Amino acid sequence: FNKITPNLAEFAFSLYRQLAHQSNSTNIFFSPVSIATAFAMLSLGTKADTHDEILEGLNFNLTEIPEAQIHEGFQELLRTLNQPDSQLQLTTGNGLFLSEGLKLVDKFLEDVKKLYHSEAFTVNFGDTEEAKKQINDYVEKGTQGKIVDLVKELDRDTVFALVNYIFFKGKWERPFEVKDTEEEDFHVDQVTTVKVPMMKRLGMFNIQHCKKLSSWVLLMKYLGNATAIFFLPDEGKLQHLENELTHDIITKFLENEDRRSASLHLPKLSITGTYDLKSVLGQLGITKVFSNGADLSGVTLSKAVHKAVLTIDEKGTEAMFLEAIPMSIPPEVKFNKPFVFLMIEQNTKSPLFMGKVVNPTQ
Amino acid sequence: TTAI
Amino acid sequence: TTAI
């Protein structure tokens, strides 16, 4: 469906809203599914408030959905995410990292393997530099070399760590031509611009202006089972757009199939988001696991980090179809000022990644 | 798109 | 890329 997609969606927006206010001035990029998957998997060895906070903090109402059905949700999500169509690359994995002489509840062990398909590794936390090396190695491998250094610090007492990675690589169903990419202005401010390489294409797009959001809404399909949604707010309407996004509205857009002519300008870019999940998630009512009272007892971990990297370009491949373009003048739709976007997996409809581009050359 |  |  997925049973938990609505929740993941709402989590993505809560978490986004928190990142946006404040910094207010920084590119934003994160994977809502990576964060929620790691903490749903963690919650499984917690109890009492510590536990409840986590699931509530993930936008699951506990007086509403059976806790078991959540984890079956995540189990089915993960299964699905790891069966991409052959023209799409999509992988996710969870890793557990354990001290040699650490007392582990067998139940917790078998839950994460079954529900979260987790791998498990013994490491020597006695050698802090080397344990980090081994953790960051799992990620480097999962991420095909792109992330060499997720974890930069490890408290001396730690005997346990949990990692989720997701790797996505996609090709546009209807790509841009490299010949047409040219340097244009990007309006970081109402009065300030920077130069960015700007892709463009005249084509028939699933594009519309939505009054409820005061934004243009563009859906771009990848070959295989995924879509990107881009949102361009009307002048002075970014905040309104940020405040009015809901699962229901996005679901509607996904259902729309009409195409119309537009001259689309979209920046070629790379952005990265790096987050300290303590301050950020504590702002969403997940404080206990970070503190002493932490009921870490269903297992037998204070620091939490998230890093996400985006790259967008013309095709997605060094490696045909024809659109009927009407006479009428096409609207010029330029993603040349701050915008929001969402990446959605098709089968699950889950929010793989979400972000905001304030300045592509930041 | 690459997203990691 | 999430680590706890």
Residue numbers in the entry:
A (entry chain A): 23 to 322, 329 to 347, 351 to 393
B (entry chain B), C (entry chain C): 2 to 5
Show sentences the authors wrote.
Away from β-sheet A, RMSD comparisons of the crystallographic positions of backbone and side-chain atoms indicated minimal differences. Comparison of the similarly high-resolution crystal structures of native (1.8 Å; PDB ID: 3NE447) and TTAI-saturated α1-antitrypsin shows that only β-sheet A undergoes substantial structural change. However, in solution, TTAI binding significantly perturbs the backbone chemical shifts for the majority of residues in the protein, with the exception of those within β-sheet C, which are relatively unaffected. This indicates that, in addition to the clear structural changes in β-sheet A seen in the crystal structure, TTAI binding in solution induces subtle but detectable changes throughout the rest of the protein. Taken together, these data strongly support the binding of two TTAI peptides in the upper and lower parts of the s4A site in α1-antitrypsin, with binding of the first peptide facilitating patency of the rest of the site for the second. The binding of two TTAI molecules stabilizes the protein in a ternary complex by favoring the population of compact conformers relative to more extended states such as those previously defined by IM-MS as polymerogenic intermediates.
It proceeds from a metastable native state, via an unstable monomeric intermediate state that is polymerogenic (M*), to a hyperstable polymer assembly. All three methods were used for the detailed characterization of the interaction of α1-antitrypsin with the reactive loop analogue tetrapeptide Thr-Thr-Ala-Ile (TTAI), the most promising polymerization-blocking peptide developed to date.
